[PDB]
Design a protein around this ligand. Structure first.
Ligand code: W4N
Ligand code: W4N
Ligand code: W4N
Ligand code: W4N
Ligand code: W4N
Ligand code: W4N
Ligand code: W4N
Ligand code: W4N
Ligand code: W4N
Ligand code: W4N
Ligand code: W4N
Ligand code: W4N
Lengths: 133, 133, 133, 133, 133, 133, 133, 133, 133, 133, 133, 133
């Protein structure tokens, strides 16, 4: 049973400790243990992100999404996620409520199933464990 | 190794499905599996909550906190949690970003290690699994 | 048939003309005439107020509530009242719209059946007469 | 002893259960019982409303006012009511704090003796009973 | 099949090119072609406007409305239109989003079927063509 | 040479010292001395006010306007005055900046030639003396 | 004579009744009848949208634009449209004033010739009929 | 009987038609006719302005004040004028409500007897004529 | 002659240098020197704080109050202090204007005699010295 | 050991009871008792105030500052005080939180060591006693 | 020694006088004179811009950035620039503070070394001259 | 050919590295090289600054202005600069967008030719080089 993990702009740069390739490996391993398949994806392109969301909508597949900056700015992304019928878990590696004020609003949260912030890369793994149950 | 799970006002009423006593049992079981001890606590009294936080500060013990309504309103609670040296995970059973606008601000988040909302009672279990690692 | 009349912080001090004990007597008499029983209660403690609301929820009993200052400040109180299935009448002795600006917002009103302000202690009696019909 | 009951724009349409003519009858009956005379009036015209308020000012007669939409919008109406020396009870059939945000501000409340919202057509009768005492 | 075209304050003054009488003629002709009857009406009086809306509510007839200034200011007008069961098309000759900031909010839009701004007098004709289909 | 003096809602009530009839006489006398004719007018009706403004537009006659409450609320009135080609002097008997905050904004001022507030009934006479020169 | 119809992010998904391909056909047919050619285009890519706008600027060709989410968010898109010398009609299938508050602001409207919202796919056809005349 | 006319920063530059020296002459002449003495003064220095206000306070002499930019910015100036026991007329040559938004707030107005804006240099003469009566 | 020193939530934790017990001793000593008696008190309970304020009201005794977080949040506390007839000095150990923005508003200040912030524990002693004179 | 006491605009006018000269004497006496020298200074000139602050910066001398109106308005003054290495005590004779809303913000507080408001002229003496210890 | 000059959306259109190709030539020449190499780049694609920023981060190369509309809207772009270790000069050809209000906020400025606006294409050359020294 | 360089409050204190006298020398040298004369000036006095601006207006000479704190606060200064016919370059040594929020608004920018912030003392030299071309 399949889960999509979609990362947005600047998440390629993870480890400006952990690199993005490692994150894929961690997630892929954790997903194996839980009896899931993780499809992990990254793009700085909104249009590319939207296409992945569209497909997940069509497939009725759940999504773990970390949209980077677009979280606070993209109504379009929000609208594609609003179409998903399966669960959507919004994920942030950092605690967004501990930095600038503008980071404390999210267009995705209201239409998300739930949200995890500030638990680093393990937020992704916790999100997997939710969708497993 | 010990973890405090502190629930605030109105969380006694859980199951206006799951009752609070069951939640304690779920958490206590999940904590056992992870090789932790969970001390779970509930109070409609802010002063009582603050005392539990004080003690966790003194003990250097981590806290999973779901402060109910006081999340959006209590600076005092925020200040007691700010004193905790161990991790603090803020937890909400509901997605607060999907209801009233006033629910989308939290005095605790900025001083928390991280935050989980909208994953129901499993948010508590995911928070345990974080502190385990 | 029973009605709960719950007063919050500072309402013990009524008559810094009429004292709170007199208010209880007025209400108890007026309730008798209407063929009701009034249970009147006062506390400066939010937790104590919440317990009385919880019980009224459980009992399916209606509530006339004057929460004093907590009206403008307590999300927790709002959430306990939101659980009441019977009518909730919000009451204020003073006209709150005639004093400071901060007094002109109420967390309770939106989840209340209705609201009476500025008719003094008779607001309580008018509220009784509503619930009678 | 006389009481004016003034309804504003759209209150002719009551019962898009109860019709406005019935409301007049209810009020007229309830006023009889209390040993008052009710003069009930309705207009979609602000100028017409203002004239009725002017007269009540001049007569020193009290007013129960439900100004419909003009409550949230008319400074002029507010200024005519500010001139009334007798009591002014502001009335709303609906709970205005339960609908749109713009409905939660009133130019009349601060200059009113008091306010009743969300108790339906009985709000008018409760207001009568106040002015009786 | 009948359509009401209601213009509010200051629309008598059209052509401080086209006069209001001409507008009636254009609309009446265009409506003929579409196999409708247009009843066109203008008033600087809110109460008069409300009466026309009431009637359209009662008749279950659709309305094309250009309320002039009252668009940004009248809650009462909004409430009468909210009662209409047939379509309501909000029309503005000018682009309101190109002038003052206060012109960019409308109490009618949220309760309207749809809105046309900045297409001049042809906005009325386009609105007719909608209701035809 | 002619000047229109237009008063809005509640200005009939002047002298809840000076009555409105006296004001007309003062203005008419002062206008005589200056070699003008004053046409003074009062209405609680916005539509009636707008008609007087329309006519002054058409006549190219100047206007001294005290719109009462409608100053802070009417976009429609603003739009009729915006059409006047001759001078428009906005007048207020009271100092509006000394009372409520909502009184300190005016839709008319930006489109007026100028404004006089807080000089009582003499504001009208000063406005006449301007238009004389 | 040519008209560009440009749709933005998520409009490929139309018919999560009508599909986007059908919309192209409707528009192409309606344009034929009016003696126009419609060039219809869709992209989730802002840069791709901007290129189409640039070209329309250069060609001096008019544009009917439905930018989806980017309407409320893109200053860049606004700036490309500001360069168009021919008419620009802003189109929205839904009534944006009936959903979230953030949907009620548009960077495009002020620089657009005019705007149509809430008339579904026929908004595009009405926009064509404008540009025909 | 004496009147102080105090101009603030940038009013030396009048006539970047009329020069400031001419303004003094106009005022001095008009004051003569009214049987007053005008003391006219100008300074770009706030401290210098405050000293003139202090003196007028002490003397119990009235003041016509045009504080230029300091109107919208100086609490200190406001506080010196608040001490004046005689009338204070606030004057602006331009209509401040017709330019930038920041120009539409004044710290002086609330503590002024009254205000004249947009009647050019004659505003000063009208203000004299007030204080004469 | 007696002075009440009331500390609110989290002030038990002073010295997460100086402990609260030491603070009591400092104050008690300083009060002795000034020929006063200091009654010092601390509670994390709002209701408990309110009771101490009530008593001081009744006794007509002055109060030095440091309400911790409740300063920025409690209308109820504000209302109890508003009843005190003797002086009320509001005290804060830290400079509240140097931390978060939310700390820079206080419900108590407007109804306090005066306020001391940022002078550490000596703020209490300075407040004593005021009430001595 | 030296302390600077700097008063700003309008503080010359103290005693529109106590005069400024008396205040200097009180402070000079109290400073003597504490084994300090007080240099007290007053100016309506910001530039003059800034020079005194500059000098105190250079001297590394502490400052007790009551800037009058400039407190709420001067960023420049704030920047000179930010340079002081010794303590800065901000002083206000009145309770600023009890008057207008604009008086409740201060550019100085965040960069001050601490603040005293509403304790009249004794605020200066209390501030001296701080710097003594 | 290398400098990156990155232009965002709509800057291809420069010269709707100077064309973008000319700008490249000007910059390339000016950079030669200063003993630098300029790499100039333009894209309407955010993802493409981000890639260029990433590379400059990795290379530790400085950047002169004119992000067009994305300046006021992109948090993602801000986050990529925040990673640059070398200087970042933000450039705008126009004075953004002289047009719409929304243009007067920039997500880039706070994380930029510095900013140049309103000096036209020479802003780029001035920025080069900075990085030279 | 002459350029005025005007610095405001607190810029005398430069080098609480570089002193103001050095800055004058740098500018004077750089201006020589460019075939200009620099007249550099500094004052903590607004009135003194305004006089220098007036003169530059009269002379039709350009100005490089760094008004310190007055940038964010002085409407008067803004109005004197608005009169300058030659270019006005606004200069800030620091990046104002990287410190407090209040520093991110400027009354001068909208009426300036352009703005340079965060490039230290070289901002002045870059501004010279602009005016040279
Ligand atoms: O913490 C996150 O995962 C977040 O989603 C990511 C970004 C990225 O643009 C920046 C970032 C990139 C990698 C790790 C942490 C932060 C930030 O823009 C978001 O505000 C928060
Ligand atoms: O979702 C939560 O866990 C939350 O912390 C709890 C409350 C409680 O007051 C209401 C509540 C109580 C039990 C389950 C869900 C919600 C709400 O006040 C908070 O806004 C959100
Ligand atoms: O008028 C009320 O009944 C109200 O609920 C009560 C309080 C009390 O805290 C103060 C109070 C207490 C007793 C009578 C009137 C007012 C105020 O805090 C509320 O704003 C209004
Ligand atoms: O609830 C009320 O009585 C109220 O005064 C009336 C209106 C009317 O315009 C609409 C209305 C009309 C009749 C019954 C309920 C509501 C609303 O505009 C007001 O917001 C509330
Ligand atoms: O453009 C409209 O049709 C509008 O509804 C009309 C008015 C009128 O008051 C002014 C007006 C009147 C006639 C044509 C254009 C504008 C304006 O008040 C509205 O803001 C816009
Ligand atoms: O002072 C004015 O002339 C003013 O225009 C008039 C009204 C009137 O509604 C109330 C009024 C009526 C008569 C004299 C003073 C005030 C107020 O509504 C306006 O705010 C001010
Ligand atoms: O109603 C529109 O056409 C609108 O432009 C489109 C979107 C799309 O993102 C969502 C959408 C897509 C298809 C049909 C209706 C709405 C929304 O983002 C806009 O707010 C409104
Ligand atoms: O119109 C006024 O008299 C006003 O008081 C003066 C200024 C002066 O700074 C600018 C000015 C100077 C001379 C004539 C008109 C305007 C402006 O700053 C104020 O906003 C308005
Ligand atoms: O500085 C204070 O004394 C203050 O009243 C106290 C608290 C306490 O909750 C935290 C605190 C506790 C002990 C010393 C300093 C600060 C803060 O909440 C208040 O904002 C400021
Ligand atoms: O209370 C203060 O000392 C204050 O600093 C002084 C002023 C003075 O401008 C007015 C003033 C002058 C003398 C005593 C009290 C108040 C006010 O402007 C400030 O808001 C408060
Ligand atoms: O002035 C700039 O260089 C700016 O960065 C550029 C844009 C461009 O989208 C529009 C533009 C394009 C080319 C020259 C001037 C302005 C605007 O969006 C920005 O607000 C300002
Ligand atoms: O950075 C600037 O040049 C600025 O104009 C100057 C000031 C001065 O008051 C403080 C200052 C003085 C000297 C160098 C940097 C900053 C600040 O007030 C402004 O906000 C910024």
């Amino acid at each position: 049973l399949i889960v999509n993990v979609i990362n947005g702009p600047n998440l390629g740069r993870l480890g400006r400790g952990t690199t993005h390739d490692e994150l894929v490996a961690l997630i892929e391993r954790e997903a194996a243990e839980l009896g899931l398949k993780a499809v992990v994806r990254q793009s700085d392109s909104e249009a590319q992100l939207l296409d992945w969301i569209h497909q997940a909508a069509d497939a009725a597949e759940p999504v773990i999404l970390n949209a980077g900056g677009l979280t606070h700015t993209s109504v379009a992304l929000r609208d594609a996620c609003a179409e998903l019928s399966a669960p959507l878990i919004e994920v942030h590696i950092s605690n967004v409520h501990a930095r600038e004020e503008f980071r404390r609003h999210s267009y995705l949260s209201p239409i998300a199933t739930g949200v995890i912030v500030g638990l680093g890369i393990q937020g992704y793994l916790l999100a997997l464990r939710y969708l497993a149950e």
